[PDB]
């Protein structure tokens, strides 16, 4: 290769994009934006696979270009805009809204959002950096740069953001008495309560989280996304609540 890669082959796409293998040679490449390449779902697939509004991808351009879909506090006109984490998603022309969420079955699920709870969106602190001029600020999960935040914030907490005002509402610390929902690999799609965190000075920090029903699972620190403090749920969890069913009610249940 001489430079950047543009064409994404169908199979090289992440497996959680619901794509087929005989549909076509290429897959829509998500552009640069607020979330990663494999941590996203392109806006073209959302309106053609999950929503089934368009027969093919040509008609997606006849939708986004009309200034129809609103994401976060602004409104975009990019066909393949990168849609990743639980950032809100509003389509006023159809009077319906959704939310891109993980599920325990390793996919991207869309939980409907009402107009009352689409006014704010959660964000995750990635790092606290003392900028120039003695001006500290924190980089969020969506890559959002924000001005002077609460000085009590750390680099691994969570901030309750508002879209229109763009100000911090509430903060939940990363401690032992809180709850989190996973964004990782096997553990992603699982909610639970942090019970113990072991620190390894060598490479990684490992944390133990217990599910609501008592199930205990292990994951890395980089996978932790705190959803609340004290088993309280600050957003609408998916239909399955994010519990990890022990496959007893999947093979047998699907029979009937």
């Amino acid at each position: 290769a001489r430079g950047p890669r543009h064409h994404l082959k169908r199979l090289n796409a992440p497996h959680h994009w619901m794509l087929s293998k005989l549909g076509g040679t290429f897959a829509p490449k998500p552009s640069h934006g607020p979330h990663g390449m494999k941590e996203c779902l392109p806006l073209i697939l959302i309106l053609r696979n999950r929503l089934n509004y368009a027969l093919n991808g040509r008609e997606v351009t006849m939708i986004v270009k009309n200034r129809t879909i609103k994401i976060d506090g602004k409104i975009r006109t990019d066909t393949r805009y990168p849609v990743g984490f639980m950032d809100v998603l509003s389509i006023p022309r159809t009077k319906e809204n959704f939310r891109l969420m993980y599920n325990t079955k390793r996919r991207f699920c869309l939980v409907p959002l009402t107009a009352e709870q689409a006014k704010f969106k959660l964000c995750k602190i990635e790092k606290r950096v003392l900028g120039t001029g003695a001006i500290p600020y924190i980089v969020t999960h969506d890559g959002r740069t924000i001005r002077y935040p609460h000085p009590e914030l750390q680099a691994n907490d969570t901030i309750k953001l508002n879209l229109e005002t763009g100000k911090i509402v509430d903060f939940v610390k990363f401690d032992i008495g809180n709850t989190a929902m996973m964004i990782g690999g096997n553990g992603m799609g699982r909610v639970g309560v942090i019970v113990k965190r072991e620190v390894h000075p060598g490479s990684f920090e490992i944390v133990h989280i217990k599910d609501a029903k008592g199930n205990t699972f292990t994951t890395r620190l980089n996978n932790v996304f705190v959803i609340g403090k004290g088993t309280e749920t600050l957003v609408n969890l998916p239909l399955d609540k994010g519990i990890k069913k022990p496959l007893l009610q999947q093979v047998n249940e699907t029979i009937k």
């Binding site: 293998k21 005989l22 093979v251 029979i255």
Partner: protein
């Protein structure tokens, strides 16, 4: 590899080509079912071996094996309604 579309075979020719202990028994099934040729006899033989091995691999473990319960229940369930 050349094509993305998968493919498979169904019948495998018996190793010994000429036996009088296997020629007579082939017409006891061809004439009885009114079969056209000997392709079908090899095809069901593949089918029986398709699950005979599956039953044998998971029969060697304990009755408490999670994989034995998971695939075994599906294996018996699939083979009961058929």
């Amino acid at each position: 590899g050349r094509c993305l579309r998968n493919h498979s075979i169904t019948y495998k020719t018996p190793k010994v080509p000429y036996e009088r202990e296997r020629f007579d028994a082939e017409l006891k099934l061809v004439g009885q079912f009114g079969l056209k040729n000997k392709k079908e006899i090899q095809r069901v033989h593949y089918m029986l071996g398709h699950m005979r091995t599956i039953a044998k691999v998971m029969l060697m473990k304990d009755a408490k094996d999670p994989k034995r319960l998971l695939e075994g229940a599906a294996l018996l369930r699939r083979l009961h309604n058929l």
